[PDB]
From a paper:
Here, we determine the high-resolution structures of cyclic di-pyrimidine-synthesizing cGAS/DncV-like nucleotidyltransferases (CD-NTases) in clade E (CdnE) in its apo, substrate-, and intermediate-bound states. CD-NTases share an N-terminal core domain with templated and non-templated polymerases of the nucleotidyltransferase (NTase) superfamily, but the C-terminal helical domain shows a higher degree of variation. Three conserved acidic residues in the central β-sheet of the NTase domain coordinate with two metal ions (A and B) that are essential for catalysis. Based on sequence conservation and structural similarity, it is proposed that the cyclic di-pyrimidine-synthesizing CdnE proteins, including ClCdnE, EfCdnE, and LpCdnE, form smaller donor pockets that act as molecular gauges to recognize and retain the binding of pyrimidine nucleotides but weaken or exclude the binding to purine nucleotides.
The native structure of LpCdnE was refined to 2.46-Å resolution. It differs from ClCdnE in similar regions, with 1.32 Å RMSD for 276 Cα pairs, but the α1-α2 loop is missing. LpCdnE, which makes cUU, shows 36% and 34% sequence identity to ClCdnE and EfCdnE, respectively, which is slightly higher than the 32% and 31% identity to EmCdnE and RmCdnE, respectively. Despite the differences in local regions, the dispositions of the NTase and helical domains were similar in the native structures of ClCdnE, EfCdnE, and LpCdnE, respectively. The four protein models, two from LpCdnE-UTP and two from LpCdnE-UMPnPP complex show RMSD of 0.56 Å to 0.82 Å from the native LpCdnE for 281 to 286 matched Cα pairs.
Author numbering: 2 to 16, 21 to 297
């Protein structure tokens, strides 16, 4: 027997200074770089630690280092919009030089043994500064919605070493999560944590359906569930409402990420709605009562 109400209430508990320490140490690594200290660079958390949805004690902090003066624009929505109308200035400093200089600064502060270069981010681990971070080099990304040099949504843009382009909207993710947590009486992020820990519990116990469901996907999926299903006094009922809605609405769905900009499913995502439906069925079966 399992008191799933009690288990979901315990799994909804939050963790505060980890993200702040990571940001401060990466910022200090940048400020000690001669070339990067003069640049217009922002350092800020993103992901679960930013959104207060982190549930694993040993998970890395997602830190974004954004060079704000390099701009990459998505013109797909506005016919006629281009660099000329957007007043894009040509720049000598490139994304590769920025990433290489950031790698040099990270190695300078934290040591080469603690810095590893990946396709998208740097894996940083330095116990001397208590830093366990995924540090993403990004530039200013824009999504225009009108033929006007200011009519755009601003986020971050990543150029992986293996080619291609990626757009992130960390501020939008954060603010949308904050607003949904406000309109649900802080139950939204509680249920996010509970369901993420449910997925982790299922993955550790060998359920294959829980393996390809990462944290950000869970946060997006739970954000999609309407607010009416987060009311009441039973956390288990909220989890079951979320699973029911997501399971019976996903086939006809045309959902977006929590930023309400990027589509949740598509060629740009490594997940598909079949995996999500299978995981939802597994979780539902796992939490039911009187099941032999």
């Amino acid at each position: 027997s399992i008191d799933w109400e009690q288990t979901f209430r315990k799994w909804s508990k939050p963790s505060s200074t980890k993200a702040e320490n990571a940001e401060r140490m990466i910022k200090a690594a940048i400020n000690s770089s001669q070339i990067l200290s003069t640049k217009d660079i922002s350092v800020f958390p993103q992901g679960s630690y930013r959104n207060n949805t982190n549930v694993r004690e040993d998970s890395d902090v997602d830190i974004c280092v954004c060079l704000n003066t390099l701009v990459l624009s998505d013109y797909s929505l506005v016919p006629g919009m281009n660099d000329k109308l957007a007043e894009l200035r040509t720049a000598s400093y490139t994304y590769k030089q920025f990433k290489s200089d950031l790698e040099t600064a990270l190695k300078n502060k934290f040591g080469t043994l603690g810095v590893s270069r990946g396709d998208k981010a740097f894996d940083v681990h330095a116990n001397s500064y208590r830093v366990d971070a995924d540090v993403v080099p990004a530039i200013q990304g824009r999504l225009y919605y009108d033929k006007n040099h200011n009519a755009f949504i601003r986020g971050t843009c990543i150029k992986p070493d293996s080619g291609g382009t990626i757009y992130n909207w960390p501020e939008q993710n954060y603010s949308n999560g904050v607003n949904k947590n406000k309109s649900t009486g802080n139950r939204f992020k509680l249920i996010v944590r509970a369901i993420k820990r449910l997925r982790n519990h299922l993955a550790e116990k060998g359920y294959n359906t829980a393996k390809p469901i990462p944290s950000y996907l869970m946060e997006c999926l739970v954000y999609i569930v309407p607010d009416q299903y987060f009311t009441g006094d039973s956390y288990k009922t909220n989890v079951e409402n979320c699973i029911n809605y997501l399971y019976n609405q996903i086939d006809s769905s045309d959902w977006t990420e929590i930023n309400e900009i990027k589509y949740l499913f598509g060629s740009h995502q490594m997940w598909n709605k079949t995996q999500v439906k299978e995981f939802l069925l597994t979780a539902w079966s796992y939490i039911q009562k009187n099941l032999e």
